[PDB]
Amino acid sequence: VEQKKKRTFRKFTYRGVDLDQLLDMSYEQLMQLYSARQRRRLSRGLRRKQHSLLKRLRKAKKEAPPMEKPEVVKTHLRDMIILPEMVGSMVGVYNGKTFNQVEIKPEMIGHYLGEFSITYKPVKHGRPGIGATHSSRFIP
């Protein structure tokens, strides 16, 4: 963790627990910390063949040489509950045309994957065109 407190020796947590104890929690003990939506998504949450994301995310944090990073598992699965096991990974999330890389931070916990890869360019405006105002229309 990259700051003095956030999941550190000095006091900050997630919901009252450390990342280390979070990796020692099971989905049931863990869903009692998540907010309501993620609790419903896990309670109902058979996660049928979303488990490939979880597998391929491991087996790639393992082959990572020490003091380095894994490369990019890349996916279309925009609605994946970020779990305390997915942390530290390197993920490419589909935009609609690109895969955009996202390094996973601990603070991303309980948020959604798609929430880190926006689907459009932010607007900045041109000049109004020939139909823009009720006065603007006339050509001879």
Binding site: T13, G16, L33, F116, G129, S136
Partner: protein, 145 residues
């Protein structure tokens, strides 16, 4: 009738002494009116005396209730901050705890650049509202060149 002091300076904000005590303390942030009635009820205070008609010892009885609600038996579904994201506590942030807790929440969001953090940054609408015909702050543009 009752011509002693009225105005009182409860923590960091000037509570006017004239209004009914319920609607008097609402001048504190984080303390709406539905929370205030509960605080006053659990404080046993009469609800037909203005802020000017309370001595210096009832007001502490009310403050300590506003600050420590969980222990005066005000249930955990009244508090405005719940399972606090950084440490799991439940409480009412009161006066500048509200400002700092909003500030920290927006910083927390922008830090990992979530889609809401960027919307707070760019100064736009964060929920799902259309934006084509609403907000509409800026100045008129002309078609002339």
């Amino acid at each position: 009738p009752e011509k002693f002091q009225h105005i009182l300076r409860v923590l960091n904000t000037n509570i006017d002494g004239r209004r009914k005590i319920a609607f008097a303390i609402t001048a504190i942030k984080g303390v709406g009116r539905r929370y205030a009635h509960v605080v006053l009820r659990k404080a046993d205070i009469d609800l037909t005396k203005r802020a000017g008609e309370l001595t210096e010892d009832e007001v502490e009885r009310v403050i300590t209730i506003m600050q420590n609600p969980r222990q005066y038996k005000i249930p955990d579904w009244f508090l405005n901050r719940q399972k606090d994201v950084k440490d799991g506590k439940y409480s009412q942030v009161l006066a500048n705890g509200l400002d700092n807790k909003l500030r920290e929440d927006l910083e927390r969001l922008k830090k990992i650049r979530a889609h809401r953090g960027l919307r707070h940054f760019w100064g736009l609408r964060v929920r799902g509202q259309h934006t084509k015909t609403t907000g509409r702050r800026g100045r008129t543009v002309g078609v002339s060149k």
